[PDB]
Design a protein around this ligand. Structure first.
Ligand SMILES: CCCn1c(=O)[nH]c(=O)c2c1nc(Cc1nc3cc4c(cc3[nH]1)OCO4)n2Cc1ccccc1
Ligand SMILES: [Fe+3]
Length: 287
């Protein structure tokens, strides 16, 4: 008995809304106005259907300032920290999608850019989905993406994904063919897979797509989106203070995914091609 899974891109309409409303420690928890703004974003995502243009948003001066603060600091770090594929694609986004300190890019523009480059596209998502449903988007080269901005009281830290994390952390690598293929194959492996297998694929995703390191020309570089949008952990990850291990799915999938602190350990992939090969070998063992 295989569980239901999407068979075509529009089938994500039936799981994208199955969202499993701020946590007590959220910076905007007591902010009625921010709460109202978040309801606005959540409704845009809930009402979205595949085929729609993604609704364009007029961001407030406050939201744009928060983005600018994060953008400015992270861009100082990227040349010495980010992998070559990230650095190659970031300027294309400045040119074609309006990445600037004083402008938050629109998801529809970024989606059109990705569609041309690698066939990836964006779907706005209200909030957290099951790992099964989130990974199933990747099978159709769909990235479920938050559209809201973090609270302005703390521009540097966010307990959840926001659109700064999506646009600065995830998008430049989805524009890279080798990474897009790697990501899609995680989604494909997940379709109709056992609960057990889905969880293991989710953890492998976490320690590559979200917090991965890679080796390039003998150096350690960052490709994980969660690192690329966190000023403090981006620096920490390439400091001598961090614990590092080679990416190895059978080992990596045993590691706990930390959400409110720095990771205990980071995994180093040799290349996106090699990570992809290692996942192919791994998925055979859990089908
Ligand atoms: C299968 C992987 C786990 N996983 C899941 O099971 N379901 C998801 O919906 C999911 C997810 N992962 C991410 C995307 C994501 N990026 C993150 C970056 C972070 C983070 C959490 C993140 N979740 O904390 C540290 O930095 N999402 C999208 C998401 C959207 C809105 C709120 C939370 C999460
Ligand atoms: Fe993420």
């Amino acid at each position: 008995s295989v569980p239901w899974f999407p068979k075509k891109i529009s089938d994500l309409d039936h799981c994208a809304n199955r969202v499993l409303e701020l946590d007590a420690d959220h910076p905007g928890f007591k902010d009625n106005v921010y709460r109202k703004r978040r309801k606005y974003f959540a409704d845009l995502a809930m009402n979205y259907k595949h085929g729609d243009p993604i609704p364009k948003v007029e961001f407030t001066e406050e939201e744009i300032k928060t983005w600018g603060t994060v953008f400015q600091e992270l861009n100082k770090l990227y040349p010495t920290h980010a992998c070559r594929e990230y650095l190659k694609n970031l300027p294309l986004l400045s040119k074609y999608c309006g990445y600037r300190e004083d402008n938050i890019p629109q998801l529809e523009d970024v989606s059109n850019f990705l569609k041309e480059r690698t066939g990836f596209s964006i779907r706005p998502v209200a909030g957290y989905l099951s790992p099964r449903d989130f990974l199933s988007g990747l099978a159709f080269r769909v990235f479920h993406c938050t559209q809201y901005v973090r609270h302005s009281s703390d521009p540097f830290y966010t307990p959840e994904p926001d659109t700064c994390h999506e646009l600065l952390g995830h998008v430049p690598l989805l524009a890279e063919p080798s990474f897009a293929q790697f990501s899609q194959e995680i989604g494909l492996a997940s379709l109709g897979a056992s609960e057990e297998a889905v969880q293991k694929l989710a953890t492998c995703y976490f320690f590559t797509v979200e917090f991965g390191l890679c080796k390039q020309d003998g150096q350690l570089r960052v490709f994980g989106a969660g690192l690329l949008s966190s000023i403090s952990e981006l620096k920490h990850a390439l400091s001598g203070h961090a614990k590092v291990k080679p990416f190895d799915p059978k080992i990596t999938c045993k590691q706990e995914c930390l959400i409110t602190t720095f990771q205990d350990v980071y995994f180093v992939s040799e290349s996106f091609e090699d990570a992809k090969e290692k996942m192919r070998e791994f998925t055979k063992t859990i089908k």
